[PDB]
Write a protein that binds this ligand. Structure first.
Ligand SMILES: CCCC[C@@H](CN[C@@H](CCCC)C(=O)N[C@@H](CCC(N)=O)C(=O)N[C@@H](CCCNC(N)=[NH2+])C(N)=O)NC(=O)[C@@H](NC(=O)[C@@H](NC(C)=O)[C@@H](C)O)[C@@H](C)CC
Length: 203
């Protein structure tokens, strides 16, 4: 399918025989699913996100059907806020990110989808994250007014400053919208700006 990003990219998956809903997440290295039992052997791991680390169980070589497309790979199980399909399995199903519905750059997901952005006069690197509602930038002295906000994900919540109507050029494509500023470990471009540049998921 071709999937636009006006709403969260939620799909049905089948894993262990069970149907579950999960988010297609270009900003996730790995696939992480809420607590459940998987047939077999696992090992403990820690993984990180916007707001810290959590402990998970790693299962290897697990068959997963994602909207009808077959994958077999690593699934992490633990207290994730949302079930997420990460790049380890998105690559198996042939998923790419495409600008302007395919006329613009194609970005494969073998490595993190990092691109150059321009914001407040400054050039920065940022991750294109289909699993982020909002755009979150590293502490930057933007002039202007703001409101407090808290945003969540793996590890909990962080406090940020919400600025509106901020221009953000992404790989040469102009966007303008809300930007959240705070201590994120990676600059994140979320769906609020990805939609403005005609970014789609395709497989
Ligand atoms: C789970 C919640 C939905 C997915 C998540 C994906 N964001 C990326 C951001 C990249 C990091 C800042 C992510 O967490 N990636 C993880 C996913 C876990 C994974 N293992 O793949 C990752 O790739 N982690 C690497 C990063 C390295 C960690 N550090 C280290 N190894 N030293 C890893 N392998 O652990 N989205 C988010 O966290 C966003 N949350 C949301 O969009 C919504 N919040 C919630 C709770 O649903 C909305 C209501 O705010 C944040 C940014 C706010 C806008």
């Amino acid at each position: 399918p071709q999937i636009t990003l006006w709403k969260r990219p939620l799909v049905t998956i089948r894993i262990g025989g069970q149907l579950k809903e999960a988010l297609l997440d270009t900003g996730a290295d790995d696939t992480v699913i809420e607590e459940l039992n998987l047939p077999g052997c696992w090992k403990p791991k820690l993984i990180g996100g916007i707001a810290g680390f959590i402990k998970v169980r790693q299962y290897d070589q697990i068959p997963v059907e994602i909207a009808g497309h077959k994958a077999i790979g690593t699934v992490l199980v633990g207290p994730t806020p949302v079930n997420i399909i990460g790049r380890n399995l998105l690559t198996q199903i042939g998923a790419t990110l495409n600008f302007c519905g395919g006329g613009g750059p194609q970005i494969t997901l073998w490595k993190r989808p990092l691109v150059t952005i321009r914001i407040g006069g400054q050039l920065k690197e940022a991750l294109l994250d289909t699993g982020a509602d909002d755009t979150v930038i590293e502490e930057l002295n933007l002039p202007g007014c703001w409101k407090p906000k808290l945003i969540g994900g793996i590890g909990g919540f962080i406090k940020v400053r919400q600025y509106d109507q901020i221009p953000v050029e992404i790989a040469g494509h102009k966007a303008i919208g809300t930007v959240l500023v705070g201590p994120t470990p990676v600059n994140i471009i979320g769906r609020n700006l990805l939609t403005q540049i005609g970014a789609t998921l395709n497989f």
